[PDB]
Design a protein around this ligand. Structure first.
Ligand SMILES: O=P(O)(O)OC[C@H](O)CO
Ligand SMILES: O=P(O)(O)OC[C@H](O)CO
Ligand SMILES: [Br-]
Ligand SMILES: [Br-]
Lengths: 246, 246
C-alpha cells in the first residue's frame, strides 16, 4: 500500500526562536508506522531546520530554480538545497503559479532539474475558480500533470499534491467528496498515460483546507494519500494531522 | 563626500565550501578608508555567510517580500533577514523585474516594508533595450526612482543602483560616459524631486559590466559612487574593485 505522506509547508512564517520551538514539538511526536513526514521551512532557514529536526523528518525547500548556478538574483538551486541537507523540494505550489506567475513550462523544467540532481519533488497542481466554473477542472489538472510527468524519469521520487485553488480565498468550500473526485481522476490519468503500476504507487496528497477536526475524514477518502498542510503546520495540531489514519 | 560603496551580488552561485573560500579571501582584504562593502549571498546561505564574514563587511539578502509573515511559499521577509544577521536587502534587481516579472508597484511596497523593518535597501533601476532605443531612458528610470522615493522615509538607509539592462545580454556595450550620463540625470531627479541635500548624499552605484581592468575609469566618473558587482564578485578580482578609487 501507499505510505501515508504528510508535508508541513511553513510558507513565509517563523523565526529561529519559534521555529526551534515548533521543531521541538515535532521531534517529540511519535510518527506512526508507514507514515512519511516532510517539513518545508522558509528558504533562509533550510539549513537551520535540518540541523534541529531529527532525521526521522525530512526537509524540503519551498521552491528552486531550473539550473545549478547562474545569474538569477533571489533564486536557489537543487545543489544548494542538497548542500543544506534537505532532500525534497516543493514545485508548482499555487502561490508560485498564481501570485508569482510561474508557468507550466518553467515548472516542468524545474522538476526535471531537481529530480536529476537527486531531490524528491512534491509537485503541486490545481485549478482556479474560473477554470472550475467553466467545467475544465480535468483539462487543467491533466495538462499540469502531463507537464510534470514529461519531466519524471523515476516516479519513486515524486509525490503529487492537489490544491483546490478554486476553494482557497474565493468563498467556496471543497467537500471531501469533491477532493476525492479530483484525486480519482488524477490517478486515472496516471493509469492511462504513464502506467497502472505508477498509478497504484504514487501518493496523491490533498493541499486544501485541513485541520485536526477534518483530517480523519479526508484521509479516509480512497485516493487521498496524505496532505500538504499550510497554516496548521505551524501549530501542535500538525501532529494530529500526522495521525489522521490512526 | 559620499562614501564609496561596493556591493557583491553572488546571485545564484556558491556552495558552503566555495563560499567559505571566497569569504576567507574577502576577510583578508584590507578595506580602504571611507569604503563600504556589502555582499549578497544566495538566500539559503544568508546566515552561513554572516557567521563567516567579518563584521567589517555587511550582508544583504538578494530579495524579500512585502509583509512580515504570510502565505507566500518560497518568499522571505525582512524580519527573517534581520534574524539571520543581515542588514541590507537588494530590491528591484533587473533579474527580478525582467526574468521574474516583479512590477514597480510591488517593488515600492517591498522598499517600504524593508525600510520600516530597519534594513538598508540597495534599490535597483534601469531601462531595457527597447526603452533605450525609443529614447525613453529618462522617463523609465525617473518613474522607477519615483516609486522608490515615494516609499523612503529615511534616505540614509538607501543606495540606488543603475543597471544598464539595455547593455546586458543584448550585444550593446555601455561606455563609461553613457553610465555617467544616466547617473547625472538620476542625481538631478533627486535634486528636483526630493531635495538638494538628498541628491548630494545618496550613493548612486553602477550595476553594469565592471572588471578589475575597467573599475578605475568607471569609479572616476563624477556621479558613479561605487558598484553592484555581478560575476566578478565571486572571484579574487572583487578585491581590486573594492579598491577602484585607490
Ligand atoms: O494563490 P491562491 O492559492 O491564494 O489562489 C490564487 C488564485 O488563482 C487567485 O487568482
Ligand atoms: O534581466 P537581464 O538583466 O538579463 O535583461 C533582461 C532584459 O529585459 C531582457 O528582457
Ligand atoms: Br514572527
Ligand atoms: Br558549484
Amino acid at each position: 500500500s501507499r505510505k501515508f505522506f504528510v508535508g508541513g509547508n511553513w510558507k513565509m512564517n517563523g523565526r529561529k526562536q519559534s521555529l526551534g520551538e515548533l521543531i521541538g514539538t515535532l521531534n517529540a511526536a511519535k510518527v506512526p508506522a508507514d507514515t512519511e513526514v516532510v517539513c518545508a521551512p522558509p528558504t533562509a532557514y533550510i539549513d537551520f531546520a535540518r540541523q534541529k529536526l531529527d532525521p526521522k523528518i525530512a526537509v524540503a525547500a519551498q521552491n528552486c530554480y531550473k539550473v545549478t548556478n547562474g545569474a538569477f538574483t533571489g533564486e536557489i538551486s537543487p545543489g544548494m538545497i542538497k548542500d543544506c541537507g534537505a532532500t525534497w523540494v516543493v514545485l508548482g505550489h499555487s502561490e508560485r503559479r498564481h501570485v508569482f506567475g510561474e508557468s507550466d513550462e518553467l515548472i516542468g523544467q524545474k522538476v526535471a532539474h531537481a529530480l536529476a540532481e537527486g531531490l524528491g519533488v512534491i509537485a503541486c497542481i490545481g485549478e482556479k475558480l474560473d477554470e472550475r466554473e467553466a467545467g475544465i477542472t480535468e483539462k487543467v489538472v491533466f495538462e499540469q500533470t502531463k507537464v510534470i510527468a514529461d519531466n519524471v524519469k523515476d516516479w519513486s521520487k515524486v509525490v503529487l499534491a492537489y490544491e483546490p485553488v478554486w476553494a482557497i480565498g474565493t468563498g467556496k468550500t471543497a467537500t471531501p467528496q469533491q477532493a476525492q473526485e479530483v484525486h480519482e481522476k488524477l490517478r486515472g490519468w496516471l493509469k492511462s498515460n504513464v502506467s497502472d503500476a505508477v498509478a497504484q504507487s504514487t501518493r496523491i496528497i490533498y493541499g486544501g483546507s485541513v485541520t485536526g477536526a477534518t483530517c480523519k475524514e479526508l484521509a479516509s477518502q480512497p485516493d487521498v494519500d496524505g496532505f500538504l498542510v499550510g497554516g496548521a503546520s505551524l501549530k501542535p495540531e500538525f501532529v494530529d494531522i500526522i495521525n489522521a489514519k490512526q
